From a paper:
Complexed structures of each drug with hexamer were solved in a P6 spacegroup and their mode of binding compared. Analysis of the hexamer:PF74 structure reveals that, in addition to making contacts within the NTD of one monomer, PF74 interacts with the CTD of an adjacent monomer. As a result of this reorientation, the 2-methylindole moiety forms a planar stacking interaction with the side-chain of R173. Cation-π interactions such as those between arginine and tryptophan can contribute significantly to binding energy, and computational studies suggest that in a solvent-accessible environment they are twice as strong as a typical salt bridge. This indole re-orientation not only allows stacking with R173, it also reveals a hydrogen bond between the indole NH and Q63. Whether interaction between Q63 and PF74, despite being absent in the monomeric crystal structure, occurs during binding of PF74 to monomeric CA is unclear; there may be a requirement for hexamer both to supply R173 to orient the 2-methylindole and to position the side-chain of Q63 for hydrogen bonding to PF74. Together, these extra interactions seen in the context of the hexameric complex structure most likely account for the significant increase in affinity seen on binding of PF74 to hexamer vs. monomeric CA. Nevertheless, superposition of the P6 hexamer:PF74 structure on the orthorhombic uncomplexed hexamer structure showed that the interaction between PF74 and CA directly displaces the stacking interaction between R173 and Q179 that stabilises the ‘closed’ interface conformation, with the 2-methylindole taking the place of the glutamine side-chain. For this reason, PF74, like CPSF6 and NUP153, cannot bind to the hexamer when CTD helices 8 and 9 are in the ‘closed’ conformation, although we cannot rule out the possibility of additional interactions between this region and the drug. Finally, the tetrahydrofuran derivative has lost aromaticity and therefore the ability to form cation-π interactions and has the weakest affinity for hexamer, reduced by >1000-fold.
Author numbering:
A (entry chain A), B (entry chain A), C (entry chain A), D (entry chain A), E (entry chain A), F (entry chain A): 1 to 5, 9 to 87, 90 to 180, 186 to 219
The structure:
């Protein structure tokens, strides 16, 4: 990544590398994997981002979907930012493929990211990757919120956990009280109805405790 | 977070990230998880705080209660601190949503936290989160102190552990001798009665050892 | 804690935090936990010390005894050092509750600890905590030294280990040859008697090997 | 490796050393081992690269293939860059065997890598090694893409994972929609045929979900 | 410990603390524990050395022998270096109890160790401790070298391992070919006799392979 | 070790210490242990090298062979470099025993290693140790290359792994195609014969796949 000390390039650490590999091995593409990726790739160059994605073994259906998303965003970038035999020793303008690190060198990437003003190719590429990762999360979300209904003897708290877990995956962690009540079991629904509208989640959970 | 070297921004470390994820996985929302969160988020930006909260998988009923608490505190902040097309290159005043990191950039957050004098948006947001976490702890406290009574053959020490464990959860670690005696078993109660008032916990525990 | 680079404040590390939590989980309040706490809290602010104590789940009977000890020492501090509407921008004198971190801010704590000359509130508070921890160790010491006697077929070395383990807990690691001999079994006692007085532990152990 | 602070030599870290040894022990020569090697050997001298390769126990058939590849590339380097009793205290030009670290000292390697302009012998040697590693990956790829066909009751997602896993190994992670459809089972093939051409992978996977 | 940056005091690290605790837990007082202690206590103050010794739970017979050894060496130090109401703001001369850290403060210890010329109280105290540890190792050595004899079907290599393991413990790793031959089994003894004198260990082991 | 910042002495790290102990515990004296030792002892003083060797428990037959090798090399050093009551405050010339750290202090070792020009006693001693370690590896190599022959149903790849593993141990990783073919089973030998001479290992392995 690029870090302070002056802004200088640093090697990706074994700790960072292992942390990413392990979270994928344990969590696959549960929603919480996205903010972990984002956090672990803080200051990342496009090379660093490709490194992290490449260290993943398996999950290749998802990674191909990721590739396709990246290619679309790169095509759109080029449409919005067309580049014009470059002047000797001068910084060239990055194309989509340069941002994704397929046609740019590390030194070029460092040049853009540390320029004044910077062309933040690390942040732009991360944005495309996170967009692709959110799509994978939505695809792999196993259950519709319509099918999350409280069991006859399921504690209300356990039901609320499932409801908001499902909502998070279906929306890729991007921001329902009435539906929560509607999908509650008849005993807790009666109690929640009696609370009326404007009840907080805390109050609803206390009531069905 | 923001740290010294001059006050500069640093990437959240994999060690910090993993420590938070693991403590939640092992301890859920036992009271001791709060001071761990506070300690692990030392110097945290609002982005860092959202990162830590987002890395948590599951417990989504609690996180939604947390969200609601944050939104209330943000609404109250705006009521107390209304903001007035900003002057070119000047620092704007943070709204509630800027403190919670939904409408502020990392650079803006860095600007407020390192300003002279600082607008400590990291500390303000942490305060709202801890307030929400304490409510979760109180909600998930399984037992009333009224039901913590010493067993006929339960060692006094074991009883005192349960009593103060329960008191801590019920009060979210925010600061009873008579009730302790009252809920003791008849043999130890007789002994403690004979000690009289003004006995320390140490003396009470020695007496029923 | 406060450390050198100039004396500056640093965030407590995840390594330190986890080390303390784990040693308590594994060793409870065996004597060796005290020097570990002292070592892990090197340079600690009162906030850091409260953090470490708060990260402990369970053992709440002991922590309440710790609280009581802290409150006594704070009351005594105030008796010895009474404080007199403070001058603008000037350092106030710490009360007992400021040293224990209940009524002082981190910035105030940093101010006292790094002042010239320093008011070492971190060291003063640690002293009160260690005093409380030593009392817990003495309370939880399961066996009197009077009951540590060598078994008929127990190796002398194994007996000496138990004797000095017990002595350490009973005295909270704060500094017997005749009693060691007296509590030895008849065969080793005969041999040790024949060595006479002035025998070192090494010589005694060699003799009953 | 060589790193910034001025460009200076640093000892390879135990963390780096162990990370490489462990990834080989767990993953052998699965494709994802290559980007891990590349990442762990960031800034590596030829000595460092030989160190990492030498710390591997077993897999000696592969390492001999690696040796042969390195020797070929070294022979080609010498053909392209012939060297001409060197001037006192002056930098000599590296031969193939100097780049591979068999006939060069660490100090010479440091001299080339930190020269102005640099002769990047660490990067040149890594390139030869990665070339050899990609060949090992292609050799050890157990299955042809022609044999990856969707099972009668195999979920489409599971099939796509195998297809792109196989494609990655066969091509050593160096960059098929029609073949994917062709190798799908009759039920999903019917559905995919009906989507027509121009369908993204996402759309194809949604359709056969 | 005291380290470079100027010679400054640093807190003992959790890594160092845990490494010492664990090596004792796993190896007790096998000979190899001594050089580990010495290495882990590099630059240690007397306080640091007491910390490390105090973090050990159990083994209290050995630690009491250690105490006695330390007290003897302290008594001898005072005999050799008698100290003479000290001049204001001046460095006092350390007594035995100051070197062992029972009557000296950390600041005094830092003063002696970083003085010009230094009074290396950390190194002097470590020397006394290692002397005591070597005695513990000799005491706990379970077997005399006279009882290490090669089994009828024991591989010569396995016998040599036991012989030199025993010799190391008996001598506390402080520096026999004829005895090695003498204690060999009749078949290997015949072969070694035929080699004659002046045979290296390598040659002897090859011969009885 | 000695490292850059100016060349200064640093304490050997707990990570380094543990890494060496563990690799020996897991790998004994498999060939790959040598480059690990070399890598872990980067910049090592003779004291550091003795530390690492001393932290090893067991394997004492091998360590005695190591001792003997070191003593021979020290004797040869003295023969080649005889030393001549030294001038006050001046650097003395190191003897063999000074290089091996038996008669030299750490400060003397630091003096030689950081002198201009340096007398690299750390590198000289490491060379003697590695020479001794290579001999141990050759001694403990369990199998002659003459006995590595492909099984009737053993995959060619598995056979090549054994062949080059054996060759590495027999030669202590110091640099056969005809012998590889000669020791292949009759079916693969027929195929390899038909390839003719000049076949690479890759081609041979593809042919017998
Ligand atoms: C964790 C989570 N669950 C969801 C369910 C449905 C939709 C989105 C989500 C999210 C992501 C989610 O909303 N995460 C929060 C952080 C957070 C996490 C946990 C508790 C409180 C705050 C976040 O990133 N931001 C910017 C945020 C902050 C305050 C209020 C609203 C949003
Ligand atoms: C740990 C704990 N148990 C409780 C039970 C009921 C109510 C609150 C709690 C707490 C939190 C709790 O009180 N923690 C203590 C720190 C502490 C922890 C353990 C032992 C001694 C001191 C704390 O944070 N502060 C500021 C404090 C310090 C000294 C006296 C009183 C309070
Ligand atoms: C470890 C231990 N066991 C005891 C039994 C009864 C009373 C006290 C104790 C102690 C604490 C104990 O005495 N620890 C020792 C350090 C130590 C530990 C182990 C071996 C040698 C020295 C200590 O802290 N100091 C200051 C000390 C140093 C030298 C002589 C006497 C005391
Ligand atoms: C991971 C993978 N699977 C493959 C299958 C066939 C051929 C090659 C491969 C690769 C390597 C692979 O292509 N890795 C990608 C990084 C990557 C990994 C995972 C998802 C998205 C991007 C890469 O290194 N680069 C330079 C790249 C970046 C964007 C588009 C195309 C290529
Ligand atoms: C490891 C060991 N085994 C022994 C058996 C009997 C007596 C002493 C010992 C020792 C300690 C032992 O001798 N350790 C060696 C280091 C060493 C360890 C292993 C192999 C080679 C060199 C040592 O510390 N020094 C100073 C040394 C160095 C070279 C020659 C002689 C001594
Ligand atoms: C790993 C190994 N196996 C062997 C079998 C017989 C003889 C020696 C060995 C060695 C040591 C071995 O040769 N290691 C290689 C590094 C290496 C390791 C693995 C693959 C490619 C290169 C090495 O140290 N050097 C200097 C080297 C580099 C390029 C060509 C030839 C030698
Ligand atoms: Cl893969
Ligand atoms: Cl979730
Ligand atoms: Cl608790
Ligand atoms: Cl091998
Ligand atoms: Cl103990
Ligand atoms: Cl040993």
């Amino acid at each position: 990544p690029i870090v302070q000390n002056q802004m200088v390039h640093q090697c990706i650490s074994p700790r960072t590398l292992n942390a990413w590999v392990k979270v994928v091995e344990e969590k696959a593409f549960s929603p919480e994997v996205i903010p972990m990726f984002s956090a672990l790739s803080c200051g990342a160059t496009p090379q660093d981002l490709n490194t992290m994605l490449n260290t993943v073994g398996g999950h290749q259906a998802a990674m191909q979907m990721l590739k396709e998303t990246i290619n679309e965003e790169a095509a759109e970038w080029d449409r919005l930012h067309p580049v014009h035999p470059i002047a000797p020793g001068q910084m060239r303008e990055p194309r989509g493929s340069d941002i994704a690190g397929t046609t740019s060198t590390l030194q070029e990437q460092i040049g853009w990211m540390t320029h004044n003003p910077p062309i933040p190719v690390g942040e732009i590429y991360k944005r495309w990757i996170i967009l692709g990762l959110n799509k994978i999360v939505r695809m792999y979300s196993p259950t519709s919120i319509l099918d999350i209904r409280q069991g006859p003897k399921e504690p209300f708290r356990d039901y609320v956990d499932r409801f908001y877990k499902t909502l998070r995956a279906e929306q890729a962690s991007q921001e329902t009280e009435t539906l929560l009540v509607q999908n509650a079991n008849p005993d807790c629904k009666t109690i929640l109805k009696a609370l009326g509208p404007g009840a907080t989640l805390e109050e609803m959970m206390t009531a069905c405790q």
